[model samples]
Target: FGWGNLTCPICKGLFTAINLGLKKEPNVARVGSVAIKLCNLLKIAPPAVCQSIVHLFEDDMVEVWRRSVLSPSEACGLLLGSTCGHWDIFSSWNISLPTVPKPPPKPPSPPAPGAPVSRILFLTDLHWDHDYLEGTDPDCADPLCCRRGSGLPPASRPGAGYWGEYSKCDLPLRTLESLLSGLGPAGPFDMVYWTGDIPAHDVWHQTRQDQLRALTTVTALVRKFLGPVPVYPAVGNHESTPVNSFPPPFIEGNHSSRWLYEAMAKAWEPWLPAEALRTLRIGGFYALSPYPGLRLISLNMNFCSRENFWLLINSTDPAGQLQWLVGELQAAEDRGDKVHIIGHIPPGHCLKSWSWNYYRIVARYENTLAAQFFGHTHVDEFEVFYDEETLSRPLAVAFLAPSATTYIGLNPGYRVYQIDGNYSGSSHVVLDHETYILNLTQANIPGAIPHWQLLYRARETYGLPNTLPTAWHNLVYRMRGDMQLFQTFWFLYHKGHPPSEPCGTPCRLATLCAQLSARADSPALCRHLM
Candidate 1:
């Protein structure tokens, strides 16, 4: 990813031949030296924007340019968002999961009248920047700022605070340690779903070794605090050196993801069993059985991400993970076992083709898939899965937990979910969830101790019926008319850090309607799923 600067000699020398002055851009060919000739021939989006997009992954684009046939119209449509009309040779096909009859709708069962609940800690998006300097300018020029300082007062804008700045800076290692230190007296969690993003937000300045170091550091902290407690982990997009460059099995060694996946396999061996580790090492995904009739799927959703440029080679069910998932779900169905899927990115935020295929899978396995947990939005949110036919029945829900870093304008936060307890026919549904945050603004005061304070509980705060899919579906509609509820939700969406000016109708609907859409680009299709 040569978006920022080209330090290596190969790129610097290779692109030094010429600089096309389109849109007054500097070193245009340097962005994707291989593509300049191709783009010039096809006249794709002028030279300015074309090179700008290529720079995001000049390394991968160069590699991909030689391998891929371009699927010209398709590539141009996807990368440059050109209007292709019916010439949609690329985007129109169905990469469908093996056809499975849609399961007949079964009414959601509320938790048993007096059923006990189990509490699970859902931690995610711990983007720890070890180089986070307190007095560094929060609004610096880099992709991830709050670096390049130490002297006296910050030059212009507010400096990065010790706890964390409400800017583009990620939290410091000490900040994560502070978060873990307070886990005690705050929890007696039955288990944890530690979805990964161990590396910081500074994607441009990361190496394979740097990413692994972050993983090791964060792993030790979780182990130190939650000793002996079960924790299930997943691979995050940022885990890769070139952020979101998770190459599928077909492509190997050159940009193989084994470096990251194997390390995760090793670091997480203590918590994961032999079976889970086997698949995890191979494909960045795995299945686990925490109890008799409940299965957990830790998905490597990077395959579905639009930003993972490697997927451009062949995104059709990369690694055949979707096929594998179907078999796993069918097996779970055979045993009448409930399933919970956890991952870094939510389906709603995935590429349309991939997100829709996942939607198909979820619809087919509705009865077996109880819930999904994710953390990439870095905000408190959820996405609902509705029946694909009527697009009305809310079959399942995805809990998009808030991030643990005070990156950007969000307060550092995590969620604790109360789920249906162990019972023969336990719903395995999330009955309720409580959020905890260390209010960065207040906690950033000199020598102040940041306590993990409860933000709000899902059911009690929203007045939900049973925290079921139907309940969340209804709440999305409820939020439409209830201004106070919507206002509260918007505030909590930022983990209690409200925006300078509240958003208007278009913005509100984008947020409200997205809850009903686990698949991307169909917010309208699922705006009223209940």
Candidate 2:
């Protein structure tokens, strides 16, 4: 009953046996109820946490499960974070690209002497916890602490850091304000890439109102500080009430993404034009030419996210978002405008099918796409894509900016990117990027105010030729043989403050792999590196 189409006897046989026991409606109710009880029985988590997650869709579990695009076993492995029964399934259809004439490659020109340049402010993942209390216990036993319901720790333990606690804490409001205030010091930025993830890490009990409040509050802060600059926004997975559960329009109901998408379109009205706002209202994705010869595509990659369980019902280019990207890229190609792809999740972090499709698109539009920007990993790192034919020449790069929130012991940070100035035939690619951070330990001293300091500039600190695709590719090689250099990167990777211990060999090699291996299903690329 579950398998409408299964190629192999084993695959069919497994689901056939499963279906023989469980019917859609009543049986699903039983299973859902049983799982909920067991989730509490095992005390794997709090009862409220369990029910908050289970009750969200358990009411319609049967129907949604019936409509799932993935094989049951594949879905289980994916949801459970294992590969035991996991294999590629045709949930998302082959993303088709429209046929467009391949024009002659434009030779990139170095900026002429005294040529003007522009910088864009990159801020992301400011997971502001509205209830953050400064004097509460910084260290706590819960997933996120230093706030309501988080029991206090021992008296010996430090109080919540004035700027931010290194423990399981999201950002305090003052920290966020300090960050915005510090932003002006490096300013005169032309635009801003305010990638999303506004909600705190307290995922289990987050309400729609709570999430929306986070969005509205953060939006106001950005508007207050950087009002004149055009800010481009991309949806992050955590924007949803259930964290990553972004249901496509086809799976309509209370579960639909309409609430989030509608609110986002309305909030972004002041920044994006009517045309771009229309598409964003439609599918949480949009394309716009901010300036002449340069285009920006903000993708709602949550559809491609593995954690978005809603994708189970129908993942195939969900809402035709990727298809829309293809059409926009073609339009850019026709007009000879350089493009920059901005999204929340990096390529490897998403479901493999989506990453592979995006990688192919990168290869296809190498000349048209000048660069890519993203922020979800909360790390200051970049991923590079190799040319499809050669698999050696670096073709494109995605810059994953650090978060403004000091979660997971990292310092809060922001980026300023220098790029070719707006003009005819300007590449509009990042020439260099500088990261600035507020040292938590120093900032939190008694009576001391938070001070944002320069952490590093990519071109100078990493000793790169430029902040281009090939330059990042070469940096990986330089780091492979030079552990010291890799350690330095790891330090910056954690916002100029990593663990006291060194990043040993395995960590070093794996990180290098991540830089080059953008395709989620492609470990072979890294294997070849070894």
Candidate 3:
């Protein structure tokens, strides 16, 4: 109670008096000020203040400020400083925080008594910049540019275009062709998950024409190469004129994104049936059953994305998409069909309230939900979802497929997921996945064929037989001790960037922490870091 009162002169006097002796330590004084300011602003009683100056500096100040307003540990950290070296200072604040019990290891459900297998190609973030001006020195602009200019003419660098020396901003026609050819041998995939981001990084100059053209060209190429296979595509944050500018359905008239929505629906009409196109016309989300006993729901997560400026206009499930999702999931459950929810920006990366609502929906349908897939971060990673009630037990996981575009320095890559074919019971998990990448540096050698090779297979590389939630949880625990495994993950995470260096403690911990979702339900695997 004494600590809670920020306006109380006694509390202020005690802190000011303590600061009088430590006037030279301005950081300490600043910490005290931040504490009182946050308490007053939040109108919450402060808990015990016991955090070190080192912990305060080590913590992300912006995150600290945000959490301090709502979290007692954060407020206490800013008030009373403790100097323990490790990241876990929250438990030392003298508050009776809830103790999270170690989740007992759940063994993989025994193969569902002879479940079949199916294969699908998951490709995403193919920032296919069609109008990429070749031979330009991108080094003059961004240091992390993929196009390192040679100062030689096109005629001089004969194989420059094919070898990836000329274009690095996004996937060019030649590179796309080469990738298609490389995938030819591994072909005849059952289904294609084409998660979006067709537009390039040229945000300021984007137009309706550019967006449509990019979508048309990319869809054409996929149709041409992977003939007759169904593609489950989702809208990315970059798939708009002013990137992520998707207005709600109620906006009406030309001001509405009806033009863009209709254009996308028309372009994808060949692949999507008339029924699926109906929803696409309304809100850019659609559900379809591509295979027997399996349903795929493609969500237009741009509506929930914080980067989308259109959110400011109307963020209230404007298209009733979530309500629609509820109905679809219920129908699927009634039919005993397993669902695969696909989207661009993951719900975990969405706005707080939106993410919370979506997570609740996920929690409700955890049994019906087989596996979730997403893109947009352009990183090779996975997010774990914990049970909403306990907020400690893992329930589901979302696999984030890497990008086909190198973007900055990351190597272009895609994933091939092998999922359980038996969707009869609540046991359709991703058995394993194989990642493929084109070596950027090696591809640049003149007259050399761009070497596309298997980067790593999830099961083999991580030594896990199946990629069930428990198996993934086991991998997370093993990463702390296995330096080699951690290094491989680090390489995959940055898309093979900085190929040689080993990941230090900070880098390893950050990567490990990424496995947990941003939701409050995330199990405290790395609570110290949190």
Candidate 4:
């Protein structure tokens, strides 16, 4: 420990460098002169700190040259202004030399026996709401804290008119159970990956302490379904928050907090095949050795307010993770094993904004990274890329599994991926009673328009927001169109009139006018409007 603490062994030699005034050249000055003096007084330093001091001096030397050749304004301009013309030629820092690719791709050897082994189930964003609150509950009684009532008129609802169309009390649990039963044996599940968002957003409404317990309950429920299977859980924004919203970028954000850290440590203790707590002196690493031929790596990239596009340091942890990841991949390659990256969010997708790290990792080590799974969007969709690049090797195909809850209109479904040797594939199977109901109904057909409207009215009165956007909203507002047609149809539908057909001739105009007048004065309309 004391090896690097001394400049020379005889004394602390803390101030020896400055005391010697070891200037090698006449009239040449040092940059970071102040920092050098301060570092000299640091009695005992680590090797890392000593190394950093050397790098700081190197950086400072550049400053000395920059100051000697240019004015304050010119120095500032050189640092901040782009090289439009003269500066580019004058600067000694030529265009950064691009790195050449390493070992080129080699021809594939003959497929080994039982090549693409094990089928992994990917699930996330279950958002189970067992702690259900009826509209009449005490918590719901708080008017200021309450959501918009579901009893509101259709057009006047807070969200889409059909918002609460899929909010069922037993829906989440039932769907999860069905999915578990349908998946059959867990032995085929080389591993189970849960990206995050196990419970609904309602967890945030609870006290911080309560939120911790709520999260564990979700995990417990998942474990009950999986039957002693090993699961790799990635931290998500919903998983935890910064300690009491502390500083730097002092804003409330989700992450694995001390409470979650403790809970997870305790819950996973018996099953933790490797170190449960990973701290990064530079950065951290966790080695999971549960099953043969597979290495699972979980990264905590949700911290540092990564969602803020304006922050530069948001990329810091991701860059570090990728570097650590590259090292891990190299180690795995040396040992002849496959690596799977599990996280709460994928690199990029439709729901949330894409993460820079996700794209970067996939671009760098595509083949070695057998798969990367993520969940946060709360939708059911998967995409498999057959051919891709990373570190000059053909990348392994990538897949995204859907959520287990219909927080939106998407039927609850999880993905089951079958990997045999060098190739893999996946399929999504829906698991819910409502899945059948939704399956039989046309997405845009008018025959079920009345039922859809009633569900919309129920949701408006229930004070729930539509979790997903309807095709109508996406096309009508986003695409921009005439509102008159929708209004006419809505009015006719609410009045219980066959409004799908308009009067074709002058003879039918009188009948249409009478129907419109009757609908305008209807009492049920008055009640729904109120």
Top TM-score hit: 2
Question: What's each prediction's TM-score?
Answer: 0.85, 0.90, 0.74, 0.49
RMSD of each: 8.5, 4.9, 13.1, 19.9
**Superior by lDDT: candidate 2 or candidate 3:** 2
Instruction: Write down the lDDT that model 4 would get.
Output: 0.40
Per-residue lDDT over 1-530 for candidate 2, one digit per residue giving the tens place of the 0 to 100 score: 56632334455456556655465567777877888898889785677767766766564455555545334556444544243355345444577788776666554777777877889988889999987888787776556788877666675876787778887789988788898887767868999998889889988678889999999888888888787899999999789877787877676656677888888868888999988888887788888888888999999889889887776666678888887888889988888898988999888888867888888888888889988999999888888898777687788889999998878888899888999888886888888998999998899899888899988888889888788788888898889988888889999999987877776998888889988888888877786567
- Each candidate structure's count of clashing pairs: 0, 0, 5, 16
In angstroms, the error of model 1 at 351 is 1.4
How many angstroms is residue 175 displaced in model 4 relative to the true structure, after the best TM-score fit?
4.3
Residue 274 of model 2: what lDDT? 89
lDDT of each: 0.78, 0.81, 0.69, 0.40
Question: What is the TM-score of candidate 3?
Answer: 0.74
Q: Measure candidate 3: CA RMSD.
A: 13.1
- Mark the regions of model 3 whose C-alpha exceeds 4 Å error after superposition: 1-108, 112-115, 142-168, 422-426, 499-503, 518-525, 528-530
What tens digits encode model 1's per-residue C-alpha lDDT throughout 387-446?
A: 788886777889999999777788999888988777788868787898999887778888
Clashing pairs in 1: none
lDDT of 3 by residue, 344-386 (tens): 9987777666677677777667777889999988889988777
lDDT of 4 by residue, 3-102 (tens): 6433233231322332233334322234445444555567334333433443433432332233332323233334444431112212211112124343
Residue 513's lDDT within candidate 1 is 74
Best by lDDT: 2
Candidate 3 backbone overlaps, count: 5
Q: What residue runs in model 2 are displaced by over 4 Å at the alpha carbon?
A: 1-33, 41-44, 60-63, 69-92
For residue 85, what is the lDDT in candidate 1?
Answer: 12
